[PDB]
């Protein structure tokens, strides 16, 4: 059913899933539609190019929306198949391969903001005995809070499967020092109900 | 002007029964089915209004509710006030409206003509 039931992200998003993700009319529509709302949701000043983090970038659809709006970014992803499709689309920003559960490898105080479109909920399940959801969520938000500059904002779009994953993400988020809230657009609809973690440092 | 390759002047000479083939299939059926007393009386009133009018301006306006009566070729130049349910639309019958009805020149409806949260704390 849901893509997270398939297995680990490095094996589910293989070469054949990467192709049909690119030529997916619903995906091209809504991934950029949410990135428009998510870029607007971090209240960054206009007429000022910023340096952003595209965590879980994948094909680079959300990466291309920043570059068309005059920003610069770097993307971090775990599967090489979605990264290979990003190279073939001739994107502008830099690409990084790694797991966000193991930490974001940048110096403290680097990015003016962090953008996240449907990557977060892949940490609530652990498909290895070495992996723990609580420590992988904390290692993400603690490293995110270090790397993000003070006063900046991180907006996170995620697809929870029940109320417990919203809770278990939130407590790990607020334990790393973030303050903010949950933005739910159309909170009582079905197709347009999108969840947005708005997080900012003071 | 030509209508189906027939000019206006002999079209006015032309009677009803050989107007059958110059119209379309809808108007050909309607003319076979006949014209009721309501539109015979109206055609006389346009004929009367064209009779007494000065020969160098348009005649007076004739107000009617007959939206379903096709435009015969002798109706050209007339002033018909056609009613959409609210007001009377004054339409001047050009010779290019022969096969058409009267109801579609008085439109009964109007066209339709049809800010995001950002958290501070």
């Amino acid at each position: 059913r849901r893509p997270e039931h398939g297995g680990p992200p490095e094996l589910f998003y293989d070469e054949t899933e990467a192709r049909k993700y690119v030529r997916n009319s619903r995906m091209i529509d809504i991934q950029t539609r949410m990135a428009g709302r998510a870029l607007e949701l971090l209240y960054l000043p206009e007429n000022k190019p910023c340096y952003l983090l595209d965590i879980g970038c994948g094909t680079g659809l959300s990466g291309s929306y920043l570059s068309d709006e005059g920003h610069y970014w770097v993307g971090l992803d775990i599967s090489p198949a979605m990264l290979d499709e990003a190279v073939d689309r001739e994107i502008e920003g830099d690409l990084l391969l790694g797991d966000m559960g193991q930490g974001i490898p940048f110096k403290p105080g680097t990015f003016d903001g962090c953008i996240s479109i449907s990557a977060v909920q892949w940490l609530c399940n652990a498909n290895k005995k070495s992996e723990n959801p609580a420590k992988r969520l904390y290692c993400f938000f603690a490293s995110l809070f270090s790397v993000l500059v003070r006063g900046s904002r991180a907006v996170l779009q995620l697809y929870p499967e029940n109320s417990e994953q919203l809770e278990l993400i939130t407590t790990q988020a607020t334990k790393a020092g973030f303050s903010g809230g949950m933005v739910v657009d159309y909170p009582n609809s079905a197709k347009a109900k999108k969840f947005y973690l708005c997080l900012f440092s003071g | 002007f030509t209508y189906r390759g027939v000019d206006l002047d002999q079209l006015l000479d032309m009677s009803y029964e050989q107007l059958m083939q110059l119209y379309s299939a809808r108007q050909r059926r309607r003319l076979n089915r006949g014209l009721r007393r309501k539109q015979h009386s109206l055609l006389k009133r346009l004929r009367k209004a064209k009779k007494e009018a000065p020969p160098m301006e348009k005649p007076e306006v004739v107000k009617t509710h007959l939206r379903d009566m096709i435009i015969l070729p002798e109706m050209v130049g007339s002033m018909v006030g056609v009613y959409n349910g609210k007001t009377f639309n004054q339409v001047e019958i050009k010779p290019e409206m022969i096969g058409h009805y009267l109801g579609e020149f008085s439109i009964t409806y109007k066209p339709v003509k049809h800010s995001r949260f950002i958290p501070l704390k």
Partner: peptide, 29 residues
Amino acid sequence: PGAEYKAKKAKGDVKKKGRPDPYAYIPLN
């Protein structure tokens, strides 16, 4: 949690004129 945007006569979401397009904000702890 977005109760002011709820449509009474129909399941869905109805806009308001004073407030922005429908949403719900809940703060953290």
